[PDB]
Design an enzyme around this catalytic site. Structure first.
Site, PDB file in Angstrom:
ATOM      1  N   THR A  62       0.854  -1.213   0.000  1.00 50.96           N
ATOM      2  CA  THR A  62       0.000   0.000   0.000  1.00 50.96           C
ATOM      3  C   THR A  62       0.877   1.246   0.000  1.00 50.96           C
ATOM      4  O   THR A  62       1.906   1.240   0.687  1.00 50.96           O
ATOM      5  CB  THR A  62      -0.940   0.028   1.210  1.00 50.96           C
ATOM      6  OG1 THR A  62      -1.858  -1.053   1.054  1.00 50.96           O
ATOM      7  CG2 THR A  62      -1.688   1.334   1.351  1.00 50.96           C
TER       8      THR A  62
HETATM    9  C1  LIG Z   1      -5.927  -0.738   4.955  1.00 46.64           C
HETATM   10  C2  LIG Z   1      -6.512  -1.008   3.574  1.00 46.64           C
HETATM   11  C3  LIG Z   1      -6.293   0.206   2.687  1.00 46.64           C
HETATM   12  C4  LIG Z   1      -5.933  -2.272   2.939  1.00 46.64           C
HETATM   13  C5  LIG Z   1      -4.579  -2.010   2.292  1.00 46.64           C
HETATM   14  C6  LIG Z   1      -3.451  -2.011   3.311  1.00 46.64           C
HETATM   15  O1  LIG Z   1      -2.780  -1.051   3.456  1.00 46.64           O
HETATM   16  N1  LIG Z   1      -4.255  -2.944   1.234  1.00 46.64           N
HETATM   17  C7  LIG Z   1      -3.946  -4.355   1.409  1.00 46.64           C
HETATM   18  O2  LIG Z   1      -3.690  -4.979   0.442  1.00 46.64           O
HETATM   19  C8  LIG Z   1      -3.944  -5.084   2.751  1.00 46.64           C
HETATM   20  C9  LIG Z   1      -2.546  -5.649   2.976  1.00 46.64           C
HETATM   21  C10 LIG Z   1      -2.182  -5.794   4.452  1.00 46.64           C
HETATM   22  C11 LIG Z   1      -2.279  -7.240   4.931  1.00 46.64           C
HETATM   23  C12 LIG Z   1      -0.811  -5.194   4.750  1.00 46.64           C
HETATM   24  N2  LIG Z   1      -4.863  -6.190   2.604  1.00 46.64           N
HETATM   25  C13 LIG Z   1      -5.533  -6.783   3.740  1.00 46.64           C
HETATM   26  O3  LIG Z   1      -5.343  -6.372   4.831  1.00 46.64           O
HETATM   27  C14 LIG Z   1      -6.499  -7.937   3.512  1.00 46.64           C
HETATM   28  C15 LIG Z   1      -7.776  -7.343   2.929  1.00 46.64           C
HETATM   29  C16 LIG Z   1      -8.958  -8.306   2.929  1.00 46.64           C
HETATM   30  C17 LIG Z   1     -10.224  -7.602   2.454  1.00 46.64           C
HETATM   31  C18 LIG Z   1      -8.678  -9.523   2.060  1.00 46.64           C
HETATM   32  N3  LIG Z   1      -6.828  -8.519   4.792  1.00 46.64           N
HETATM   33  C19 LIG Z   1      -6.363  -9.844   5.137  1.00 46.64           C
HETATM   34  O4  LIG Z   1      -5.445 -10.318   4.567  1.00 46.64           O
HETATM   35  O5  LIG Z   1      -7.008 -10.552   6.151  1.00 46.64           O
HETATM   36  C20 LIG Z   1      -8.403 -10.495   6.061  1.00 46.64           C
HETATM   37  C21 LIG Z   1      -8.882 -11.763   5.363  1.00 46.64           C
HETATM   38  C22 LIG Z   1      -9.834 -12.566   5.963  1.00 46.64           C
HETATM   39  C23 LIG Z   1     -10.253 -13.718   5.322  1.00 46.64           C
HETATM   40  C24 LIG Z   1      -9.732 -14.063   4.087  1.00 46.64           C
HETATM   41  C25 LIG Z   1      -8.781 -13.259   3.487  1.00 46.64           C
HETATM   42  C26 LIG Z   1      -8.358 -12.111   4.129  1.00 46.64           C
END
Ligand SMILES: CC(C)C[C@@H](C=O)NC(=O)[C@H](CC(C)C)NC(=O)[C@H](CC(C)C)NC(=O)OCc1ccccc1
Ligand SMILES: CC(C)C[C@@H](C=O)NC(=O)[C@H](CC(C)C)NC(=O)[C@H](CC(C)C)NC(=O)OCc1ccccc1
EC number: 3.4.25.1
Lengths: 196, 247, 229, 232, 204, 220, 240, 202
Positions: H1
């Site tokens: 991000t």
């Molecule tokens: C804060 C938001 C803008 C999200 C942003 C991060 O900065 N972008 C991202 O890609 C982040 C990466 C993070 C793990 C560092 N993604 C996430 O945090 C993901 C988002 C879910 C909706 C799948 N969350 C995650 O991995 O755990 C939640 C989850 C729960 C069940 C199945 C799959 C995923």
């Protein structure tokens, strides 16, 4: 480990228990009693972790005795077996579980003699004959080979002797004396200890 | 606030609990409920108080309630409090069957409820339950048993008892008509109509104005049956015939 | 905190006057009628506003609890709104466990239990509202009444509020076991009309109907049709 | 929680709620207990026979444990609560000490509970007085009385309930080594004491005996009639 | 390995206007048998039954706690429970223990208390109901039971053919499972009768 | 599991496979993964079956109590907020991945909820072990503002991709179409796979099974 | 008629005729302040005109107000006990916040009125507390119903109104409004302010000056609650 | 991000990538990481999606009540402080890196970095996320005091583009926002709009 045996006959229930209490490699007692008088016609033979057996057994005994005082009559062998199972099963998923293997034996003037096997997980099974301990592995087959539903109390003591003689020959633990008691219409009767 | 408190759980200068006594007066204005123990079974005969013509019959009974597979009870007093006590009686019975896996003995069930009733009379600051219950049942210790409980939390086993309106007159007639050890459910279902025909001064028993339940042991099974209105009408008819014959 | 002592207690004659007084508030309420026909139940209530400055479509006296259960009342509308919420929450708790619509008899018993509590709990007064619950279950129509005491009754036809005694006498002479919801709706409007004082209009009265389809509140337009005949 | 003070002092230093409880005990049936040499006897007046009432359900003499038993005068519902608390206590004692409770141990506990209900918020004193009678392990016959105030004393013989003063006056002049030498003489002393208050005689008098190392025995109506005639 | 501690196998099959529920009868710890007559199928009404397989303590506890709720419901609602409501009730009990579950998976076999229509079902250990119109298996020989019932079950089987199918499927599946067997019991539930049979089975 | 959802011109089309598996064995060959939240809102569920069939059931009860009090149709935002604010307080312990879709007074709204509480409002969404097969179909064929038949064919093609490419997915294809004027729940929309015909008869005739005991209890 | 038995008139319990005198005395508190509030709804506007009495020249008049913003689009006019009023304004502001946080959309004015009336009813059923002596007239614009004037009372009663009044001259104001609305309603148009200003002016015989009254308004074009300035209020008063 | 915010004399420019990722899978390729906590106060969320969405929702609720009670537009510092309060209190149960940037009538345009752990610091420009590391030297070399909204919008777009091309967890479209007393102007850069840099050949 410790040895518990029960043989249910047509009008009686014969039970035996080892009489040894061990610390680690030393027997600190050879006259221990692992049988508790719940009622005048109910006995609980309990083995297991130190402190857990008497804490659970004395608890079940004082509660069965409170029933007789509160109601003027005693709990039946089946009601007592079920009350014990609920308490052992209701402390299993608790932070204070009791590691105890038991054998309830009693005589109801109506349903007759009864022997109930219960493990530490609290699974209750009515059995014609049952045993608890590592010695059960070397004796349950002797009971299966010779137990007949119409066994006499005399032939029952003889089979009890066959099983305890097997423990003296094949078991690696010195279990020399056994407490032997029988229950019937006339109540609980202490019999001579089978010593070797 | 001490000013608005009524102080329900306190004694009186003569060692009397007046909230309990006032509740007992309430019970004496409710529909007559009679219980008779026979050698073959037990019976409860209540006087229907909901007798309007626009009332729908949507339940097994209005005054009789099954608390177990071997126990039933009728109530006299405040209906709302009876619904509370009957629900508690049913749970106590189920809680015992869970711990021991055997049906609850009858006096053990009555004692449990009376212990709850007595607690509302000693502490809490709340009014007592204005309901007296007549319990009928069968156990493998004493067999067919009839019991009566009061708002005081005081219970007692009886061979024949009445609670409600004109209850005293009923107990008198039952006392001079009950033959201990020689009572069959037929003679029991007969003295019931006789007592109701005197306690219920409102005309003669009309079958719609009465409810009759019987507990019997059939093939090792306790069966509770509320007699159908046809059966009750036949009973009331026989009583009329007998009285006329003796005239 | 709060008072932990019962405000409702027994009088020397063995009577709880606070509940007797709550029934006085129910008898001073606007007239309500319920009729159980063979194909459904009609719940009709007199809804007369004090002025033309009130939005009549804003607050309702006939309210749905589930989809087969509907309620009407006579007494204090604020206390009624509390019992409507509890009835809906009790009805949902049933579905969450048995995954089936709550039997109307089970709902009346559960609601009557809450009402009885307010007669024996501490620091609280009994509910000054009598409720008329209509429900369709097991292909049968059900009509039950609930008193401030916690006592529930099953009825084929009943009236509450002002002129309830004369209304019950009218229903006794008009009610016929073999009736249809449409004929029942007419008799319910006639019963309220006997004790209305004015011109019953699509907005002076509120009617709700329960059938195999479920409970619903007859629209002012639909009621306009019935009042015409 | 309702936390009002039901039991409070009054000008002149009188806890009227406790005095009202004793008025209820005075309205109770007469209970008499004589402590003999090898037999402790407890007898209660069966007010009305009722005729249509199972007696097994209205017994005012109970057994708290194998060695202890009690009789009561006052409210039957309050008594059932106290008897159940004492029965549970006797068992808890056997579990934490591995010995039968002593007669005074249980008398002390029943009194301490009857006392806390007189100095606790939201509670009314218990309207019951008890006669705890048993045999200590040494084999000493024991008779104690508890009051709704929580006060307890040991007695050679006492009477509680209606006509307690009259019966106690009688026992005061008829208690001696002579009327206690024989178990039958001890039983007839309690019988005569109640007969002073009981009008029916024999028909309306329950009685129980607890000999040493033996369970409580409820004398059958015929056995009671035998003594009643011999005592006539 | 918490479900294979005590072993077990239960199966429910639908017929034309008839249901069947079979269970093994062995009660054992790991590899030691203690009894050959343990109950795993319990009556939940005149034409309603529940077979429980898993930890034997959990089989007994779940049955007893289900009877508590069923008897309360039957007395309060004043009616027998319909097969589908019992399933919803077992799901509520099992999911109330979602974080710390009972190690038992239940099968319900019964006929509607009024229409007498065949209903069979299976729930997971956290209470996930799956109603089927053919057969439902649960235990340590489930894979063996799946293969046998998928190749032997036929639609509109009569009461006698349902017995010959549930029995053959149970006997050949528990004979390939070491911790299941020591006997087989079968209840055929019909509108006017409940036939219970014990089958001649390998006691090895 | 292959649950998918797309937003078309008039409303929302939700779709799901019908297979439940315990381990690597199929337990239900006809599970319902699309759930009723409200007459205007439906939710496809993936993950633990007990968690997805209880989080949805509880939200349906709460939106019903909300709609009875409000007297207005439920908003898809209310369901999303309720579902996300619950999944969050359980930190992924309740494994419920859901595709919430419905048409409210503000138009059609499709959301993706993850077991930890994260939501995403998007024009097309896929969840389950068959999510990437379904996403490949949507990233290759999705076009903004499509018609119902075109949008329904897209969601069926996405579900088929998971059914034939995923091993935790299979059986039938269910589609739920929601418009401002119509809610069409097509449970058996497409039956793509069927069991082969039996070639041999293995029926056991009466007498094949030997019994040791029998007891017939007559029922009244 | 006015029969009493027990603490019928000291705590919230039913009188021998089921009346609850304590709630009746809480409606006498609303008239203890001495001020009257009038709220009228139009075709696309809802107006809340209240009487402003700054008794001392030492009191900052910017602080003496009865108009409140519960949410950007919900406005309130409080009549009765000032401290009880600020308490309900706070409970409304909090219930409106909790609503958007849990449901994701702004609370309807009908839903805020029902919540406040439900809390008020609990003061009528419990004896530990007195009912609050204040009436809240809420105004807002519903997306599907347009202008909305709702009033809740110390008894737990809430209703929607075309036009309402609270305070000492509630009855006289009701009659004034219960004749204009009958003829053709509060002449629908943002100039519905004239009906409210003239209603309060007529009942409280007085030619209000720009500083003697406070006016709050919500409109379909500008749905946000707005308190008109003396210059805006003067424009309307000069127009009439 | 990649999240980035810069202050200019009159307001603040904010920017973010649009990529959500579960492992190496892009769950959302068009995410909005620029969330509005109030009329002129926005947040740039990074880290856990569920954790960041929950805290931003909570602060919007608390900030909304505070503004209606204190009849005055909210201060950017107050929003940053409420974000700091929760992120520090639940630092062990919350993965959330936030940039609170907005315009207030008293202190002008303010950019506050509340990093992971719960710390809060005002900054002329702020960057955050997994792609923040690849553009530290760029922002330090290209940032000049006295930049404008137009220059600040180009700085954010150029920096995010470089980070989105080097971070696998960053990419998609560049979402930009400019907040000033006038209002909040939002812009999405996609395709050729996204700034490009020539690759090498060797
Ligand atoms: C804060 C938001 C803008 C999200 C942003 C991060 O900065 N972008 C991202 O890609 C982040 C990466 C993070 C793990 C560092 N993604 C996430 O945090 C993901 C988002 C879910 C909706 C799948 N969350 C995650 O991995 O755990 C939640 C989850 C729960 C069940 C199945 C799959 C995923
Ligand atoms: C509506 C859907 C959620 C149903 C379906 C689709 O995913 N469920 C599934 O496919 C999952 C597979 C797993 C990989 C998630 N299977 C299941 O959830 C099955 C339910 C069937 C036996 C009826 N139950 C199950 O395995 O739960 C065991 C369990 C127990 C405790 C915690 C977590 C999981």
């Amino acid at each position: 480990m410790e040895y518990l045996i029960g043989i249910q006959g047509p009008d009686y229930v014969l039970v035996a228990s080892d009489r040894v209490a061990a610390s680690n490699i030393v027997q600190m007692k050879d006259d221990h009693d692992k049988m508790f008088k719940m009622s005048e016609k109910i006995l609980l033979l309990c083995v297991g972790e130190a402190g857990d057996t008497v804490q659970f057994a004395e608890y079940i005994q004082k509660n069965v005795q409170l029933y007789k005082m509160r109601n003027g009559y005693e709990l039946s062998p089946t009601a007592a077996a079920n009350f014990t199972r609920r308490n052992l099963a209701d402390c299993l998923r608790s932070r204070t579980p009791y590691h105890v293997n038991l054998l309830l034996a009693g005589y109801d003037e109506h349903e007759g003699p009864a022997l109930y096997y219960m493990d530490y997980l609290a699974a209750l099974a009515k059995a014609p004959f049952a045993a608890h301990g590592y010695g059960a592995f070397l004796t349950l087959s002797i009971l299966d080979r010779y137990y007949t539903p119409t066994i006499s109390r005399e032939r029952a003591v003889e089979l009890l002797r066959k099983c305890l003689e097997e423990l003296q020959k094949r078991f690696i633990l010195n279990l020399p004396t056994f407490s032997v008691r029988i229950i019937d219409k006339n109540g609980i009767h202490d019999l001579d200890n089978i010593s070797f | 606030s001490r000013r608005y408190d009524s102080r329900t759980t306190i004694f009186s200068p003569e060692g009397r609990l007046y909230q309990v006594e006032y509740a007992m007066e309430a019970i004496g204005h409710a529909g007559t409920c009679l219980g008779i123990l026979a050698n073959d079974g037990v019976l409860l005969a209540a006087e229907r108080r909901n007798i309007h013509k626009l009332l729908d019959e949507v339940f097994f009974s209005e005054k009789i309630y099954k608390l177990n597979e071997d126990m039933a009870c009728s109530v006299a007093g405040i209906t709302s409090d009876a619904n509370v006590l009957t629900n508690e009686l049913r749970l106590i019975a189920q809680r015992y069957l869970l711990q021991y896996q055997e049906p609850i003995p009858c006096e053990q069930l009555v004692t449990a409820l009376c212990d709850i009733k007595q607690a509302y009379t000693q502490f809490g600051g709340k009014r007592p339950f204005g309901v007296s219950l007549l319990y009928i049942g069968w156990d493998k210790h004493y067999g067919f048993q009839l019991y009566q409980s009061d708002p005081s939390g005081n219970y007692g086993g009886w061979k024949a008892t009445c609670i409600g309106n004109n209850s005293a007159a009923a107990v008198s007639m039952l006392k001079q008509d009950y033959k201990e050890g020689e009572m069959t459910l037929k003679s029991a279902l007969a003295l019931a109509i006789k007592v109701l025909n005197k306690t219920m001064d409102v005309s003669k028993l009309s079958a719609e104005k009465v409810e009759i339940a019987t507990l019997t042991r059939e093939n090792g099974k306790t069966v509770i049956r509320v007699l159908k209105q046809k059966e009750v009408e036949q009973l009331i008819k026989k009583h009329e015939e007998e009285e006329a014959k003796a005239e | 905190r709060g008072y932990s002592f019962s405000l409702t207690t027994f009088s020397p004659s063995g009577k709880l006057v606070q509940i007797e007084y709550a029934l006085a508030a129910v008898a001073g309420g606007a007239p309500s009628v319920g009729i159980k026909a063979a194909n459904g139940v009609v719940l009709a209530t007199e809804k007369k506003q004090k002025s033309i400055l009130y939005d009549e479509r804003s607050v309702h006296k006939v309210e749905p609890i589930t989809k087969h259960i509907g309620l009407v009342y006579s007494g204090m509308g604020p206390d009624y709104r509390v019992l409507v919420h509890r009835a809906r929450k009790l009805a949902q708790q049933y579905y969450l466990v048995y995954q089936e619509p709550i039997p109307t008899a089970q709902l009346v018993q559960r609601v009557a239990s809450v009402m009885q509590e307010y007669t024996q709990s501490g620091g609280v007064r009994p509910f000054g509202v009598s409720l008329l619950i209509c429900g369709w279950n097991e292909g049968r129509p059900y009509l039950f009444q609930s008193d401030p005491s916690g006592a529930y009754f099953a009825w084929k036809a009943t009236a509450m509020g002002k002129n309830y005694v004369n209304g019950k006498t009218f229903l006794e002479k008009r009610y016929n076991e073999d009736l249809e919801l449409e004929d029942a709706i007419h008799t319910a409007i006639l019963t309220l009309k006997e004790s209305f004082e004015g011109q019953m209009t699509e907005d002076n009265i509120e009617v709700g109907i329960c059938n195999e389809a479920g409970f619903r509140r007859l629209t002012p337009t639909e009621v306009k049709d019935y009042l015409a005949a | 929680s309702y936390d009002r003070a039901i039991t409070v002092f009054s000008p002149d230093g009188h806890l009227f709620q406790v005095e009202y409880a004793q008025e209820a005990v005075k309205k109770g049936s007469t209970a008499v207990g004589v402590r003999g040499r090898d037999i402790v006897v407890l007898g209660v007046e069966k007010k009305s026979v009722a005729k249509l009432q199972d007696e097994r359900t209205v017994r005012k003499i109970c057994a708290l444990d194998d060695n202890v038993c009690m009789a009561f005068a006052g409210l039957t519902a309050d008594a059932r609560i106290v008897i159940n608390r004492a029965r549970v206590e006797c068992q808890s004692h056997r579990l934490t000490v591995e010995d039968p409770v002593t007669v005074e141990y249980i008398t002390r506990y029943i009194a301490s509970l009857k006392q806390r209900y007189t100095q606790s918020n939201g509670r009314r004193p218990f309207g019951i007085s008890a006669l705890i009678v048993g045999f200590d392990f040494d084999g000493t016959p024991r008779l104690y009385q508890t009051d709704p105030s929580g006060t307890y004393h040991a007695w050679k013989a006492n009477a509680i309930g209606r006509g307690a003063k009259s019966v106690r006056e009688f026992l005061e002049k008829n208690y001696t080594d002579e009327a206690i030498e024989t178990d039958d003489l001890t039983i007839k002393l309690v019988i005569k004491a109640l007969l002073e208050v009981v009008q029916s005689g024999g028909k309306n008098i329950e009685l129980a005996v607890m000999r040493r190392d033996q369970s409580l025995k409820i004398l059958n109506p015929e056995e009671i009639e035998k003594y009643v005639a011999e005592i006539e | 390995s918490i479900m294979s501690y005590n072993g077990g196998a239960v199966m429910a099959m639908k017929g034309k206007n008839c249901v069947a529920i079979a269970a093994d009868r062995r009660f054992g710890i790991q590899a030691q048998m203690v009894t050959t007559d343990f109950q795993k199928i319990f009556p939940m009404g005149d034409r309603l039954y529940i077979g429980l397989a898993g930890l034997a303590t959990d089989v007994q506890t779940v049955a007893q706690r289900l009877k508590f709720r069923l008897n309360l419901y039957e007395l309060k609602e004043g009616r027998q429970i319909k097969p589908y409501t019992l399933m919803s009730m077992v799901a509520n009990l099992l999911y109330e223990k979602r974080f710390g579950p009972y190690y038992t998976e239940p099968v319900i076999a019964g006929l509607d208390p009024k229409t007498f229509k065949p209903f069979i079902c299976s729930l997971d250990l956290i209470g996930c109901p799956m109603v089927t119109d053919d057969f439902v298996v649960s235990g340590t020989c489930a894979e063996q039971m799946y293969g046998m019932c998928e190749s032997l079950w036929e639609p509109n089987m009569d009461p006698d053919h349902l017995f010959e199918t549930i029995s053959q499927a149970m006997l050949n599946a528990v004979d390939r499972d070491a911790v299941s067997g020591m006997g087989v019991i079968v209840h055929i539930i019909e509108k006017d009768k409940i036939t219970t049979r014990t089958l001649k089975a390998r006691m090895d | 599991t292959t649950i998918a959802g797309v937003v078309y011109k008039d409303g929302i089309v939700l779709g799901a496979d019908t297979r439940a598996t315990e381990g690597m064995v199929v337990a239900d060959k006809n599970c319902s993964k699309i759930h009723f939240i409200s007459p205007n809102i439906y939710c496809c569920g993936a993950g633990t079956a007990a968690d997805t069939d209880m989080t949805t059931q509880l939200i349906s009860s709460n939106l019903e109590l909300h709609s009875l009090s409000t007297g207005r149709l439920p908003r898809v935002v209310t369901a999303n907020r309720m579902l996300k604010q619950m999944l969050f307080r359980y930190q992924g312990y309740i494994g419920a991945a859901l595709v919430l879709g419905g048409v409210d007074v503000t138009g059609p709204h499709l959301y993706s909820i993850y077991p930890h509480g994260s939501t995403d409002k998007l024009p097309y969404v896929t969840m389950g072990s068959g999510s990437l097969a379904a996403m490949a179909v949507f990233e290759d064929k999705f076009r903004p503002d499509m018609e119902e038949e075109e949008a329904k064919n897209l969601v069926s093609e996405a579900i088929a991709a998971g059914i034939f490419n995923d091993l935790g997915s299979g059986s039938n294809i269910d589609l739920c179409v929601i418009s401002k004027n119509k809610l069409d729940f097509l449970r058996p929309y497409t039956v793509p796979n069927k069991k082969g015909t039996r070639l041999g008869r293995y029926r056991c005739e009466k007498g094949t099974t030997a019994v040791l005991t029998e007891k017939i209890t007559p029922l009244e | 008629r006015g029969s009493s038995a027990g603490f019928d008139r000291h705590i919230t319990i039913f009188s021998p005729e089921g009346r609850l005198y304590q709630v009746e005395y809480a409606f006498k508190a609303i008239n203890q302040g001495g001020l009257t509030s009038v709220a009228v709804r139009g075709k696309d506007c809802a107006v809340i005109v209240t009487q402003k009495k700054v008794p001392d020249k030492l009191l900052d008049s910017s602080t003496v107000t009865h108009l409140f913003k519960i949410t950007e689009n919900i406005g309130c006019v409080m009549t009765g006990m000032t401290a009880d009023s600020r308490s309900q304004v706070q409970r409304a502001r909090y219930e409106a916040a909790n609503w958007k946080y849990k449901y994701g959309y702004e609370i309807p004015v009908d839903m805020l009125c029902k919540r406040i009336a439900d809390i008020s009813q609990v003061y009528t059923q419990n004896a530990e507390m007195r009912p609050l002596g204040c009436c809240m007239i809420l105004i807002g614009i519903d997306e599907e119903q347009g202008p909305q004037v709702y009033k809740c009372d110390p008894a737990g009663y809430y209703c929607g109104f075309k036009a309402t009044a609270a305070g000492v001259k509630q009855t006289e104001s009701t009659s004034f409004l219960e004749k204009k609305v009958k003829k053709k309603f509060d002449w629908t148009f943002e100039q519905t302010v004239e009906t409210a200003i003239t209603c309060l002016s007529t009942v409280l015989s007085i030619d209000f000056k720009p500083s003697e009254i406070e006016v709050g308004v919500v409109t379909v074009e500008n749905p946000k609650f707005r308190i008109l300035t003396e210059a805006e209020i003067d424009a309307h008063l000069v127009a009439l | 991000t990649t999240i980035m915010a810069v202050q200019f004399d009159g307001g603040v420019v904010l920017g973010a990538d649009s990529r959500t990722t579960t492992g190496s899978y892009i769950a959302n390729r068009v995410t909005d990481k620029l969330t509005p906590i109030h009329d002129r106060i926005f947040c740039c969320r990074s880290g856990s999606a569920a954790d960041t969405q929950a805290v931003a929702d909570a602060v919007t609720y608390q900030l909304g009540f505070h503004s209606i009670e204190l009849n005055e537009p909210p201060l950017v510092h107050t929003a940053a402080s409420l974000f700091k309060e929760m992120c520090y209190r639940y630092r062990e149960d919350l993965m959330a890196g936030i940039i609170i940037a907005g315009w207030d009538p008293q202190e002008g345009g303010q950019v506050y970095s509340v990093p992971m752990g719960g710390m809060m610091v005002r900054q002329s420009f702020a960057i955050g996320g997994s792609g923040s590391s690849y553009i530290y030297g760029y922002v330090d070399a290209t940032y000049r005091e006295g930049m404008t909204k137009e220059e600040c919008l180009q700085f954010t777009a150029n920096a995010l583009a470089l980070a989105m091309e080097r971070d696998g967890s960053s990419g998609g479209v560049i979402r930009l926002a400019a907040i000033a007393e006038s209002g909040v102007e939002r812009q999405v850069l996609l395709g050729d709009q996204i700034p490009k840099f020539a690759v090498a050949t060797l």
